[PDB]
Subunit: 211 residues, 5 copies
Amino acid sequence: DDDKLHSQANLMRLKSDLFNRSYPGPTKDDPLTVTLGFTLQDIVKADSSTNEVDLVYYEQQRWKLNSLMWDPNEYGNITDFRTSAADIWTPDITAYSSTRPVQVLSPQIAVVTHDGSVMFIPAQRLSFMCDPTGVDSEEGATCAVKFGSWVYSGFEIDLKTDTDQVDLSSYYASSKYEILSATQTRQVQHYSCCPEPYIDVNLVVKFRERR
Amino acid sequence: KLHSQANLMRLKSDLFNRSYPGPTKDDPLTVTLGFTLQDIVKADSSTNEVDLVYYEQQRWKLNSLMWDPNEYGNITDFRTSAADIWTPDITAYSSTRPVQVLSPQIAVVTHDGSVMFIPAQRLSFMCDPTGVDSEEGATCAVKFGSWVYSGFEIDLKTDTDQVDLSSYYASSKYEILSATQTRQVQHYSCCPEPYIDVNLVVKFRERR
Amino acid sequence: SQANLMRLKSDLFNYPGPTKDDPLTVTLGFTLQDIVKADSSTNEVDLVYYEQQRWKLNSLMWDPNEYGNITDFRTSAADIWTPDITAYSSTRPVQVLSPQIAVVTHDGSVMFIPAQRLSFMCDPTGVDSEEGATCAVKFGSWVYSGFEIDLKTDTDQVDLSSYYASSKYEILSATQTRQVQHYSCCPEPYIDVNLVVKFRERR
Amino acid sequence: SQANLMRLKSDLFNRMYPGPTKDDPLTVTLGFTLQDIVKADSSTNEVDLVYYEQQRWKLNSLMWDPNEYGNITDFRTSAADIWTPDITAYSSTRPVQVLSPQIAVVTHDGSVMFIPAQRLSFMCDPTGVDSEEGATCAVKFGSWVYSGFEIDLKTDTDQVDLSSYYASSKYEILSATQTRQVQHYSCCPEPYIDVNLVVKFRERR
Amino acid sequence: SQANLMRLKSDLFNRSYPGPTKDDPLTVTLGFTLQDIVKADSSTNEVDLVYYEQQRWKLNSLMWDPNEYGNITDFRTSAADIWTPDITAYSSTRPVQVLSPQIAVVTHDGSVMFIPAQRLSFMCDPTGVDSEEGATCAVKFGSWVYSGFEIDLKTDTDQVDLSSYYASSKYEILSATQTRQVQHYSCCPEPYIDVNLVVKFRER
Ligand SMILES: COc1ccc2cc1Oc1cc3c(cc1OC)CC[N+](C)(C)[C@H]3Cc1ccc(cc1)Oc1c(OC)c(OC)cc3c1[C@@H](C2)[N+](C)(C)CC3
Ligand SMILES: COc1ccc2cc1Oc1cc3c(cc1OC)CC[N+](C)(C)[C@H]3Cc1ccc(cc1)Oc1c(OC)c(OC)cc3c1[C@@H](C2)[N+](C)(C)CC3
Ligand SMILES: COc1ccc2cc1Oc1cc3c(cc1OC)CC[N+](C)(C)[C@H]3Cc1ccc(cc1)Oc1c(OC)c(OC)cc3c1[C@@H](C2)[N+](C)(C)CC3
Ligand SMILES: COc1ccc2cc1Oc1cc3c(cc1OC)CC[N+](C)(C)[C@H]3Cc1ccc(cc1)Oc1c(OC)c(OC)cc3c1[C@@H](C2)[N+](C)(C)CC3
């Protein structure tokens, strides 16, 4: 009950050291790479009257800041902590073809590790632009939606995925829709309009009515 | 009475302007979870969503919240807003829509440092209701647990294997065949932490 | 006189809820305005009503004589404690239709009357018959036991003087009744006001 | 310019009107501009309107003299910055949805103009809408918590402004009026004042 | 450098805009990028449009010398933290739904660029959308509270950007125009400015 009082005291001081003394977001001089991963849980609805499809997925977001690092030794072997997302800067990762505000299904809480890495995994329901024509056929339908920063250019936020394969191991086994394939791919595009690169992660999902 | 009010504000002030940042590997917390199913409102076989109304009883206990009632005018408990205290981030793992909260976000803290919080909710979750119009009915399942704490920081426990059905609405469109809540612990090659959840399985069918 | 009002509000504000030794009695009453919807596919009924709430606090007494003949004021419900009155068989969050503003009287009584839309559990079978349908929903505190909060009605007649004359549904009767319940599981009384409405398709 | 304005506001907002009282009652003028009858639902007896509600009142505690403030005669301010009346429809079926910025104009004479655009669902039986006669519905507007002892209401005209009514609405407008009324109930000594919005309308042809 | 930015932000905000006035009017630039007509409801005559508005204005109190601040030329700030123009649709039938983060980019010249993505329901008779010639609807945008003496609204370009319009929408766009309109009304000596967006569209 004195180890425990002492360990709490260490956590509160770490959080005050990082949060109260000592983040404006990335700049071209100090750019940030966010690692993104999708875990598709369900294609919930495919609306052929409006060409909207609703997905439920988790989005794992990961980045690393020097100003969040600390030494576990000065803070009682604390190697990580949970904190509300409002306590830290988080990337404005946004779907570029959503048709309604994304609905958050999970607690807005992040895990900060001693080397400055942050991991934040919002579960979400998204309506996005998609013609589901062909979903009732063997070859199925294909849709795509890009994710990336809304306001930071490619000189300030970069992105990558650890694999092209969307994680399907939690995909709902009785969904109305069967997944034929689902890929997530970093894409850098150059436009003449603009000297900065446009970076996004493209999520391509091919699916059909479960038979 | 004007005195008991004085003692309540003082207790609160002592507990809340003196010194709890959430559980850690060094200071883990056991959350006891129990479900009371009130209604299955809707089963949608076009999207495989089912809507439940249920109560989620959450209980945990902290040293930082204990007091001696003798020192505070015999006060043995008090109510406080859930924003005022740490609460566990218990979450359904296969919801299809944000849960809608039906009850006041206020908890009851007891002098032994136990907290009870009972959010009533309507939840849409993933569920194929095929067979609901048959004798055998349909079965669905949804896992609840911490979103961000592993089994190293929050352990979950049930007080019973049975979901409380005694308040189930007797004129629901659906009748309950069985409703159980089973703690489960799981490990993955990738990761060293245990993951703990409570699996809510409900078998149900169209009322006769 | 505006002078006088700010000074009273000044004096009074500068109440953390009831306790077992300082309990609170809340008076409830309902003004049924409309049965807007009765969905027989889900057994949900939607009602629009005013939830009349009143309680009295020692804290809020004053002399209309020490303050320019000011017998009452209005204040945002957000500046004051209000009881956590909740339906016990809603299916959706309640939607509030009116400003959240309370009226405090010099006798220390607070009146707060939100108009609200509520979906609750109700089988409307029989609504297209002469006998019509009958549904019930109970209201009461969610987090205060009957040791800290008690309830009462001023009358058992639901106020129907504002019932919408052209609703799809006519009201055959509507009663509001304080209930006290005891259960073996639990050592506090369960107190609530039960609203029972009998109604049928208008003809 | 901005120094004068930032001073004005600091002065007015730092030297708060606690609402009207019986001793100092307030008159609020209301008028409606009806834009559209968006939907009429005959299964639930709910009609939806989109309108602008012009509210206007006048406080002594919001007067200033322009020459002490660089010839400023008016300013725009967030409506959460000032008291605004709790004007409410008495028979809505869904929370009212606000379609415009919650910003008011204060003028040097202490008068305030606030004009929220709103969408409103309200209790209305649309029977007869598919006929030449049309349907008729009414909704009353007034203060939720102030009786006629603290808030009096008025209109400048009892004709609803239809000059902006949408030309290709599903529903044509036959007439629309806004009438101040004073009610006295046996229960209560206070007068209750409202503006009654009555609309007749039919399916456009 | 992370510190140069953390100081620039201090100087501008927590060390000093009550919006525009008749003596200090603001020019605001508006342009539309249309992304999807999602739905046209002929039972209620509403159409739902997903689109972006590019807003741009320049303020003196947002000027700074780059070489006094680490060669920082621009930054990103939350739109809640700066004044932003009250640009509103004059005939929407439901509150706007915001699809993107509400973050503006401020440049050293004091210019501000803000690009909200939104879904907007507005009044629109879709009669004709199932025929070769389509249906035509219009929606005007402008300040709700500031006349043309306080906010002077202009288009950035004369053209609606259709380059990112979703190719597999239920509805094809046959044309879309954006045009600044000035009107004098008899209540008031001030000019009133809006930008009218006119869209002709039909079922794909
Ligand atoms: C200068 O502006 C742009 C440059 C380039 C494009 C759009 C542009 O339009 C805008 C983009 C963006 C914003 C505002 C825009 O206008 C005011 C704000 C937010 N960011 C900066 C993040 C992007 C977000 C963003 C939004 C739309 C977008 C790409 C990025 O559109 C595209 C697609 O996705 C829908 C797509 O997918 C298959 C394929 C293509 C495009 C666009 C790409 N076109 C057609 C040109 C080529 C092919
Ligand atoms: C220990 O728990 C309970 C004990 C007793 C009951 C419910 C219980 O379940 C809960 C009740 C309550 C809470 C949480 C509960 O679970 C953890 C939190 C909020 N309070 C404390 C305020 C009540 C709110 C409340 C909620 C449900 C409720 C009664 C009160 O259900 C009933 C009815 O209304 C739905 C009803 O109507 C005819 C008739 C009856 C009941 C219940 C009463 N049964 C069936 C048992 C007997 C008859
Ligand atoms: C917060 O305060 C109120 C909020 C809302 C209203 C009155 C209010 O004020 C009082 C209510 C009450 C009292 C005193 C009040 O203020 C000193 C004394 C006792 N109770 C607590 C029981 C109610 C009883 C009560 C008294 C008056 C009353 C409604 C209920 O007024 C109305 C009507 O009936 C007269 C009526 O009839 C068709 C229609 C309407 C109203 C009122 C309702 N408006 C205009 C707003 C809407 C339409
Ligand atoms: C003084 O009162 C008004 C005078 C003039 C009009 C509306 C009026 O109603 C109001 C307008 C406005 C407000 C409040 C109003 O009421 C108190 C708040 C602030 N702004 C400045 C934003 C306008 C916003 C505004 C709102 C509606 C509006 C025009 C402007 O309606 C019109 C249109 O479509 C929206 C349209 O295009 C098809 C064409 C026309 C109109 C109107 C213009 N008529 C028919 C008369 C002429 C041509």
